[PDB]
């Protein structure tokens, strides 16, 4: 409602409620958190990134995006919880305090706001952006097939009506270009975490090719350690490995792009569950999901500051 402590973390929210939450958290924690507008969506909604910083200086940074696929409600709900948790644990958890004392975190809670608004007003299962061209009656692009990393290769669809439509060219979606510009402008990201649901997976690059990344051994073990940390709280069991070996080919993906920019700790989370409820994860699962996922993310961040 009126403070981040009266905000209900155990229910799903609208775009406007999440956007309001950001302003409240900035107001309450002005020495730690600022709200950045990195662009506007196809339909002209502001695209917001929360910056968590204690100072500097172009500090080494962690990127986290949630809700690129709009129907994956657990992700935006987890993003809100993450934002609050950062303000809770800074000054409290020594490990996390050390991360924020030397690094910045950039958190994008609603990466596809038009899709999110649309899952509230029209179609709960909508996944793509809401871009339209006169070239087709079909709406939207899969924003996680739109990145300039194996763009247009097997693992995406060239058909505008497809749910995995890659768009006409790489970065055609302003929601993607806004991130690309921000990350390129910055130049000093060390981790890039893209949060999705569902399937309980922790994935590293690549999706578009079977070629092993030169950091495979390391990321595989970081992934194993993060999965163990996550499992430790409530027993939630994740599988892990490269995108292509674990699911299948997928092209134009965010972490393939981020990894190719030299951002080593590039991972994609697929949160709860494994299909019991699927996209329609019960609200009662929001806080436990956010809690355990935090443990996994923290594990990755600790490897970033110490490397």
Ligand X SMILES: O=C(O)[C@H](Cc1ccccc1)C[N+](=O)[O-]
Comparing CB distances to ligand X, the nearer of 95 and 211 is: 211
Tokens of 216: 């495979």
Comparing CB distances to ligand X, the nearer of 29 and 69 is: 69
d(CA 19, CA 27): 13
Comparing CB distances to ligand X, the nearer of 48 and 257 is: 257
Binding of residue 243 to ligand X (CB under 6 A): yes
Q: State how far the alpha carbon of 189 is from the alpha carbons of 15, 104, 263, 264, in Å.
A: 27, 9, 6, 9
Comparing CB distances to ligand X, the nearer of 4 and 209 is: 209
Element (H, E) at 179: helix 174-186
Q: Which of 173, 270, 292, 302 is catalytic?
A: 270
Q: Work out how close the CB of 274 gets to ligand X at its nearest, in angstroms, rounded to a whole number.
A: 13
Residue 116 forms beta bridges with which residues? Answer: none
Q: Which does 207 bind (CB under 5 to 8 A by kind): ligand X, Zn ion, none?
A: ligand X
Size of residue set near Zn ion by CB under 5 A: 2
Binding of residue 253 to ligand X (CB under 6 A): yes
Q: Work out how close the CB of 194 gets to ligand X at its nearest, in angstroms, rounded to a whole number.
A: 7
User: Residue 299: CB partners within 8 Å, gap ≥ 6?
Assistant: 222, 225, 226, 229
Residue 270 annotated among the catalytic residues of the structure: yes
Tokens of 65: 């995006």
d(CA 71, CA 119): 6
Could you tell me if residue 233 is left (phi over 0), alpha (psi between -120 and 50 degrees) or otherwise beta?
Answer: alpha
Size of residue set near ligand X by CB under 6 A: 12
Binding of residue 272 to ligand X (CB under 6 A): no
Q: Which stretch binds ligand X (CB under 6 A): 109-117, 180-188, 226-234, 242-250?
A: 242-250
Tokens of 190: 């060390």
> Binder to Zn ion among 85, 166, 196, 264 (CB under 5 A)?
196
d(CA 230, CA 247): 20
Binding of residue 113 to ligand X (CB under 6 A): no
Closest of 288, 157, 172, 163 to residue 235, by C-alpha? 288
Q: Which stretch binds ligand X (CB under 6 A): 16-24, 174-182, 231-239, 245-253?
A: 245-253
Residue numbers belonging to the annotated binding site for Zn(2+) = 69, 72, 196
Residues in contact with Zn ion by the rule CB under 5 A: 69, 196
Give catalytic residues, as residue numbers. Answer: 270
Provide the annotated binding site. Answer: 69, 72, 196
């Amino acid at each position: 409602a009126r403070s981040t402590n009266t905000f209900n973390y155990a229910t799903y929210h609208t775009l406007d409620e999440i956007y309001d939450f950001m302003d409240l958290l900035v107001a309450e924690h002005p020495q730690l958190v600022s709200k950045l507008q990195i662009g506007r969506s196809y339909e002209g909604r502001p695209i917001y990134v929360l910056k968590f910083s204690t100072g500097g200086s172009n500090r080494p940074a962690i990127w986290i995006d949630l809700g690129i696929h709009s129907r994956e409600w657990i992700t935006q709900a987890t993003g809100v919880w993450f934002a609050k948790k950062f303000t809770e644990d800074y000054g409290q958890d020594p490990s996390f305090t050390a991360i924020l004392d030397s690094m910045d975190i950039f958190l994008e809670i609603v990466t596809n706001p038009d899709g999110f608004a649309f899952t509230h007003s029209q179609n709960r299962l909508w996944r793509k952006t809401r871009s339209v061209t006169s070239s087709s009656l079909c709406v939207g692009v899969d924003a996680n097939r739109n990145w300039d990393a194996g763009f247009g290769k097997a693992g995406a669809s060239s058909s505008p009506c497809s749910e995995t439509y890659h768009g006409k060219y790489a970065n055609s979606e302003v929601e993607v270009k806004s991130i690309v510009d921000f990350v390129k402008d910055h130049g000093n990201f060390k981790a890039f975490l893209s949060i999705h649901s569902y399937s309980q997976l922790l994935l590293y690059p690549y999706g578009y090719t079977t070629q092993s990344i030169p950091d495979k051994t390391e990321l595989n073990q970081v992934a194993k350690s993060a999965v163990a940390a996550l499992k430790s709280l409530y027993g939630t069991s994740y599988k892990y490995g490269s995108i292509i070996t674990t699911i299948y080919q997928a092209s134009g993906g965010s972490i393939d792009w981020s990894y190719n920019q030299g951002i080593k700790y590039s991972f994609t989370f697929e949160l709860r569950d494994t299909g019991r409820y699927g996209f329609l994860l019960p609200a009662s699962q929001i806080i436990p999901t956010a809690q355990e996922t935090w443990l996994g993310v923290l594990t990755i961040m600790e490897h970033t500051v110490n490397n």
